[PDB]
């Protein structure tokens, strides 16, 4: 019996499989940050913090003693509750193939929002700095949907100016993806040109990213550490409802702040 | 006992 | 001797082979629904209904008893009669290679009409709901043959808005197929653009579909269950004519109503 | 004893 | 000693090889019908007629007797004479590599004309109906060289309207081939578009075809039966000239008249 | 003893 | 000791290797005719003439005697002298990698000129008829650099009109190559179109060809026979200079005069 | 003892 | 203990690995000359000079004696110092993944500048002549960013005029690369055209090249000899700083001066 | 004991 306590839930194994599949497909579809940054872990429930290898001096020390404190980045544990109907889960045992698992998708996208919002725009209460809020480069102000094929090159230029090599991925927020994929130049494709621009770089949709972003896929620049990977656990149940949660433990580090350029309002 | 997502590259 | 009773027909084996080949090529050419939806079966002549796994409450029950009725979807059995000339079938035994099998093709396309009409536009007397009549999305009104390259994207957008991923197939009714494939932009192809639009999605012609349709090929959304697959059986014969039939047993279920968008008058 | 059409994917 | 009687000719074996190669390359280059229709045989010199498997009633018969006559299609035997110089053939034995074999090519193209003219436009004295003269469809009147990319589609549409599936080959007469291959749209190719139009269908030149033609490559529609395949035989010789002939026995049947559409004056 | 042309597909 | 007499030269083996490599790369780069026509040999120093297999009648003969003379085409032996500095060749033995071998390249291109001039424009003193001067077809007069994409097709048409099949190679003289490869249509390539025109036919530069030429690569039309292939021999040497030569023996025959069309002033 | 050029196709 | 004296440095092995990786990635990213010219070596610390194989006459010699001096090209040894913080290197031992190695990159690009400046523009104090300053061809004056697609062809023409075959690489200085890669023709790519122009030739950025350059990749024209390849050595250290250096020994020879054409101000 | 760069072609 681990912390998920799944054997205590009034849920048949096939209903557990259905819940897990729903969450898994949502996560594989929507986790923007995980498909860009470098990935450490998972290390389990007792991994508490990432060792940075840095030391910080302590001022009030005697003359005969040199003392320094080791610097570490603690992980955040995130739990998103959701509820399911017990009868809907029971129907799986009678051969039902489409039980109502709406709240599973809701909780999974809430977890996706939490993780990607931390990765891109930081999370100050967790001591995390995002990719966007840590870049020293000036944010290109894109004026219209047709300025993107220019802007990216400019951003890419900046990346190779500062010394950041490697394929450059384009990350599009909600409006940017909508406007640049609902567009067509009288038959001639535009998004095809967009992928043609980036040298074997991926183009990814991030629902939590405001605006757009161009960032290196070189590696060693952005680091997501996961202690406990995305899991479904059981909390409680009444006669008719069962309370579950999505759980994860993670932290994110910006190793090289200059490997990305932000593109403002699409 | 996670969902086994891990890295998506 | 099964229900087809073929050994009672005054038909030589090679004539049976010719009849079966004619029907088989018609069906492989024209069965639109089977090449889109998920397929269960065949299960044979005694498969009577699809278990949905749902329960429905019964109101007039005593206080000490909870009673529910299991919900099931019965299959429909469809038979399309046709007639053939006995002498034309006899000529096969003398080495004739092109016997008159026109009524075979007629009956086979009538069966195709029945099945595809049930799948796309429903069949209320059989308790079947079609793909088109069950979609909650608004039906895009296509104005002209050149609006299709736009409309599809719009529909596709809607599909990804509601949460329906996966490749999106385009299904064209008779007029839509005729007008969009009898078209050419001064040498530059249009239908090529149409297949280019859909991300590895098929483009299929449905003679029973009114208008056009964009629907996900993700799977798990639309379910055709077949008990007895398409068969040719013998009914009766006089001195000069033999009466045969095409037979099938099937039902169709819309598991996820939101996985398709209808495009109105082409 | 059907025609063996089955699924057309 | 067969009917070709080649051992009686005053021709050395290498000269026979040269004659055969000349005829063979002409035939492989120019036989239009053989690369479109279905092929039966060869069956040799004693194959006399094709069994159709049909019966025809006989009117003047007694009441106690039913009599019918079997229907068959007799083959035609075609011989094209030509003459060669004996000294030119002798020079092959002295190491000459280019003997004068002009009349061989002349006779071979005459045989090609006979066969392809029978296949496309019929040969009433041989009881053969051609592809063009048996089609029930209306002949598209092509107005100019630029109307072909439209016309073909129209014809193709007709073919799929009447129920004729499969790849559709385009067959071009002499003028049509000349005008549509001596054409270029300011650098942009037109013939490339023409082959792009037909769905994996061949484009073939037929010197005996008047106009142009679009026909299905499905199979089972057009049937060329060959008894004795194209052969070179010896007839006679004087002191200085040797008389040879090209020989063939064949017939052609239109099984499905509706599988082709004629395009008139190019 | 023909030229062996046969079918040209 | 063969006719090249190389062991008598005051040349170290590595200097011989360098000379041979220089000549070999020039010849592989510039021999236009050898990469178009059919090739017989090499047969060595004692091959004197090509047997044509033809006989010519002799007029003044007695009535009881028939006499004919065998026709043969004698080979021409070509020697191009050149001179090298002995000290430059000695420096190879001390590890020098770039000795002055300019006269080797000069003599090799002179030999290329002789051979290709014989092949394309004939050499009447050697009894050779060229490809260009033997063609019965009319020479297309190309007016401007943009007329080539048309002219070739015309020429190609002529080739298939007269009965000459097979891939058609384009051969460009100096000015034609310069003008048609120093050209670009505002970014869009022209030479790419030129190679696209010819059906898997090569496009070759011939420095000895005046104008341009379109000729069949079918084979059996043009025949270059080589007795002694291109060789470097020693003639004489003084204290400071060594005299070498390029040597070859060859003849060229036009078997089919109609397999090429000349394109005049580019 | 030639340079071994031969045919250039 | 070699000349690098690395065992004397107060550096842990993993810090040495990090320093070497930083330098190695800079060098693989920026060494323009090494990816164009032919490469000899490395031969180690005691290789002192390149034997050219040439002799030079000496004037003041007796009549009975002929004396000549062997010509050789001595190598230059280049050392670029840099400094690192000892505590930053110590942090590697505590698990730090991003120590401050800025001066490593600075020194490595300084070495790249030295080597590439010698290769392209010569280094007279080292007796090296560059590719640009040794070419006899006239330097094409490029007027604007759109003149490059023309100019290259012109330069390429010159290269094939003088007799220099083989693929032709384009080498772009800083401004030329910036202007020709920050350019786009209203969606249509320009740099794609640039790589399309050169026949399987590479396009390389050289930070030390002024203007641009078109040069043959045939081989045997430009020769970089390396005695001691790029190495990191230790010089000295105080309590807080360690002094390291980048070291190399090399020379460059222009064997064929005519294999390149310079393009002036971009 | 170099960095092992060598030729970059």
CSV table of C-alpha atoms in Angstrom, one decimal, chain E residues 46-233:
chain,number,residue,atom,x,y,z
E,46,UNK,CA,-4.9,-24.9,-85.2
E,47,UNK,CA,-6.8,-22.6,-82.8
E,48,UNK,CA,-9.6,-21.6,-85.1
E,49,UNK,CA,-12.2,-19.7,-83.0
E,50,UNK,CA,-13.1,-18.3,-79.6
E,51,UNK,CA,-15.9,-20.0,-77.7
E,52,UNK,CA,-18.3,-17.3,-76.4
E,53,UNK,CA,-20.4,-19.7,-74.4
E,54,UNK,CA,-23.6,-18.3,-75.8
E,55,UNK,CA,-26.4,-20.1,-77.6
E,56,UNK,CA,-28.7,-18.7,-80.3
E,57,UNK,CA,-32.2,-20.1,-80.8
E,58,UNK,CA,-33.2,-21.7,-84.1
E,59,UNK,CA,-36.7,-20.8,-85.2
E,60,UNK,CA,-37.8,-23.6,-87.6
E,61,UNK,CA,-37.7,-26.5,-85.1
E,62,UNK,CA,-40.3,-29.1,-84.3
E,63,UNK,CA,-42.5,-28.8,-81.2
E,64,UNK,CA,-40.9,-31.8,-79.5
E,65,UNK,CA,-37.4,-30.6,-80.0
E,66,UNK,CA,-35.5,-27.5,-78.7
E,67,UNK,CA,-32.5,-26.8,-80.8
E,68,UNK,CA,-29.9,-24.0,-80.3
E,69,UNK,CA,-26.6,-23.2,-82.2
E,70,UNK,CA,-23.5,-22.5,-80.3
E,71,UNK,CA,-22.0,-19.0,-81.0
E,72,UNK,CA,-18.3,-18.7,-81.7
E,73,UNK,CA,-15.9,-16.0,-83.1
E,74,UNK,CA,-13.5,-17.3,-85.8
E,75,UNK,CA,-10.0,-15.9,-85.9
E,76,UNK,CA,-8.5,-14.0,-88.8
E,77,UNK,CA,-5.1,-14.9,-90.2
E,78,UNK,CA,-3.1,-11.9,-91.5
E,79,UNK,CA,0.0,-12.1,-93.7
E,80,UNK,CA,2.0,-9.1,-94.7
E,81,UNK,CA,4.5,-9.9,-97.5
E,82,UNK,CA,7.9,-8.2,-97.8
E,83,UNK,CA,11.1,-8.7,-99.8
E,84,UNK,CA,14.8,-8.6,-99.0
E,85,UNK,CA,17.9,-8.5,-101.0
E,86,UNK,CA,19.9,-11.8,-100.8
E,87,UNK,CA,23.3,-10.1,-101.1
E,88,UNK,CA,22.4,-7.8,-98.2
E,89,UNK,CA,21.5,-10.8,-96.1
E,90,UNK,CA,24.7,-12.5,-97.2
E,91,UNK,CA,26.8,-9.5,-96.0
E,92,UNK,CA,25.8,-10.5,-92.4
E,93,UNK,CA,28.0,-13.6,-92.8
E,94,UNK,CA,30.9,-11.4,-93.7
E,95,UNK,CA,30.5,-9.3,-90.5
E,96,UNK,CA,28.2,-6.5,-91.7
E,97,UNK,CA,26.2,-5.1,-88.8
E,98,UNK,CA,23.7,-2.9,-90.7
E,99,UNK,CA,22.1,-4.8,-93.5
E,100,UNK,CA,19.3,-3.1,-95.4
E,101,UNK,CA,16.1,-4.3,-93.6
E,102,UNK,CA,13.8,-1.4,-94.5
E,103,UNK,CA,11.1,-3.7,-95.9
E,104,UNK,CA,11.0,-5.6,-92.6
E,105,UNK,CA,10.1,-2.5,-90.7
E,106,UNK,CA,7.6,-1.6,-93.4
E,107,UNK,CA,5.8,-4.9,-93.2
E,108,UNK,CA,5.9,-4.9,-89.4
E,109,UNK,CA,4.3,-1.5,-89.2
E,110,UNK,CA,1.7,-2.7,-91.7
E,111,UNK,CA,0.9,-5.6,-89.4
E,112,UNK,CA,0.7,-3.2,-86.5
E,113,UNK,CA,-1.7,-1.1,-88.4
E,114,UNK,CA,-3.9,-4.1,-89.2
E,115,UNK,CA,-4.1,-5.3,-85.6
E,116,UNK,CA,-4.5,-1.9,-83.9
E,117,UNK,CA,-7.1,-0.8,-86.5
E,118,UNK,CA,-9.1,-3.9,-85.8
E,119,UNK,CA,-8.8,-3.4,-82.0
E,120,UNK,CA,-9.8,0.3,-82.0
E,121,UNK,CA,-12.0,0.9,-85.0
E,122,UNK,CA,-13.2,-2.6,-85.7
E,123,UNK,CA,-12.9,-4.8,-88.8
E,124,UNK,CA,-16.3,-5.7,-90.1
E,125,UNK,CA,-15.1,-8.2,-92.7
E,126,UNK,CA,-13.5,-10.2,-89.9
E,127,UNK,CA,-16.5,-9.9,-87.6
E,128,UNK,CA,-14.6,-7.7,-85.1
E,129,UNK,CA,-16.0,-4.7,-83.3
E,130,UNK,CA,-13.6,-2.1,-82.1
E,131,UNK,CA,-13.4,-0.3,-78.8
E,132,UNK,CA,-14.3,3.1,-80.3
E,133,UNK,CA,-17.2,1.9,-82.5
E,134,UNK,CA,-18.9,-0.1,-79.8
E,135,UNK,CA,-18.9,2.5,-76.9
E,136,UNK,CA,-22.4,3.7,-76.1
E,137,UNK,CA,-21.1,6.9,-74.6
E,138,UNK,CA,-21.1,10.2,-76.5
E,139,UNK,CA,-17.8,11.2,-78.1
E,140,UNK,CA,-16.4,14.3,-76.4
E,141,UNK,CA,-15.5,16.9,-79.1
E,142,UNK,CA,-12.1,18.3,-78.1
E,143,UNK,CA,-11.8,21.8,-79.5
E,144,UNK,CA,-8.1,22.7,-78.8
E,145,UNK,CA,-4.9,21.3,-77.4
E,146,UNK,CA,-5.6,22.9,-74.1
E,147,UNK,CA,-9.1,21.3,-73.8
E,148,UNK,CA,-7.5,17.9,-73.2
E,149,UNK,CA,-6.8,18.4,-69.4
E,150,UNK,CA,-10.5,19.2,-69.0
E,151,UNK,CA,-11.9,16.6,-71.5
E,152,UNK,CA,-10.2,13.6,-69.9
E,153,UNK,CA,-11.7,14.4,-66.5
E,154,UNK,CA,-15.1,14.7,-68.1
E,155,UNK,CA,-14.6,11.3,-69.9
E,156,UNK,CA,-13.2,9.8,-66.7
E,157,UNK,CA,-16.3,11.1,-64.9
E,158,UNK,CA,-18.5,9.4,-67.4
E,159,UNK,CA,-16.6,6.2,-66.9
E,160,UNK,CA,-17.2,6.3,-63.2
E,161,UNK,CA,-20.8,7.4,-63.8
E,162,UNK,CA,-21.7,4.3,-65.8
E,163,UNK,CA,-20.0,2.1,-63.1
E,164,UNK,CA,-16.6,1.5,-64.7
E,165,UNK,CA,-13.9,1.7,-62.0
E,166,UNK,CA,-10.1,1.1,-62.2
E,167,UNK,CA,-7.3,3.1,-63.6
E,168,UNK,CA,-8.1,5.0,-66.8
E,169,UNK,CA,-5.5,4.9,-69.6
E,170,UNK,CA,-5.3,7.7,-72.2
E,171,UNK,CA,-4.7,6.6,-75.8
E,172,UNK,CA,-3.6,9.2,-78.3
E,173,UNK,CA,-3.8,9.1,-82.0
E,174,UNK,CA,-1.0,10.5,-84.2
E,175,UNK,CA,-2.1,14.2,-84.3
E,176,UNK,CA,-3.1,14.2,-80.6
E,177,UNK,CA,0.2,12.9,-79.5
E,178,UNK,CA,2.1,15.3,-81.8
E,179,UNK,CA,0.2,18.3,-80.6
E,180,UNK,CA,0.1,17.5,-76.9
E,181,UNK,CA,3.7,16.5,-76.7
E,182,UNK,CA,5.0,19.3,-79.0
E,183,UNK,CA,3.5,21.7,-76.4
E,184,UNK,CA,5.0,23.6,-73.5
E,185,UNK,CA,3.4,26.3,-71.3
E,186,UNK,CA,6.3,28.8,-71.2
E,187,UNK,CA,8.5,26.2,-69.4
E,188,UNK,CA,5.8,24.6,-67.3
E,189,UNK,CA,5.1,21.1,-68.7
E,190,UNK,CA,1.7,20.0,-70.0
E,191,UNK,CA,2.2,16.3,-70.7
E,192,UNK,CA,3.4,15.9,-67.1
E,193,UNK,CA,0.0,17.3,-66.1
E,194,UNK,CA,-1.7,14.8,-68.5
E,195,UNK,CA,0.0,11.8,-66.8
E,196,UNK,CA,-0.7,13.3,-63.4
E,197,UNK,CA,-4.5,13.4,-64.2
E,198,UNK,CA,-4.9,9.6,-64.8
E,199,UNK,CA,-4.8,7.7,-61.5
E,200,UNK,CA,-1.8,5.4,-62.2
E,201,UNK,CA,-3.0,4.9,-65.7
E,202,UNK,CA,-0.7,4.5,-68.7
E,203,UNK,CA,-0.6,7.0,-71.6
E,204,UNK,CA,0.0,5.2,-74.9
E,205,UNK,CA,0.4,6.3,-78.6
E,206,UNK,CA,-1.7,4.5,-81.1
E,207,UNK,CA,-0.9,5.3,-84.8
E,208,UNK,CA,-4.2,3.6,-85.9
E,209,UNK,CA,-6.5,5.5,-83.5
E,210,UNK,CA,-8.3,8.5,-84.9
E,211,UNK,CA,-8.6,11.2,-82.2
E,212,UNK,CA,-8.1,10.1,-78.7
E,213,UNK,CA,-9.6,7.7,-76.2
E,214,UNK,CA,-10.0,7.2,-72.4
E,215,UNK,CA,-10.5,3.6,-71.4
E,216,UNK,CA,-10.5,1.5,-68.2
E,217,UNK,CA,-7.5,-0.7,-67.3
E,218,UNK,CA,-9.7,-2.7,-64.9
E,219,UNK,CA,-9.6,-5.9,-67.0
E,220,UNK,CA,-12.3,-8.2,-68.3
E,221,UNK,CA,-13.6,-5.5,-70.7
E,222,UNK,CA,-11.5,-6.1,-73.9
E,223,UNK,CA,-10.1,-9.4,-75.0
E,224,UNK,CA,-7.5,-10.0,-77.7
E,225,UNK,CA,-7.1,-13.8,-78.5
E,226,UNK,CA,-4.0,-14.8,-80.5
E,227,UNK,CA,-3.8,-18.2,-82.1
E,228,UNK,CA,-0.5,-17.9,-83.9
E,229,UNK,CA,1.6,-15.0,-82.6
E,230,UNK,CA,3.6,-12.7,-84.8
E,231,UNK,CA,6.0,-14.7,-86.9
E,232,UNK,CA,8.3,-14.3,-89.8
E,233,UNK,CA,7.9,-17.0,-92.5
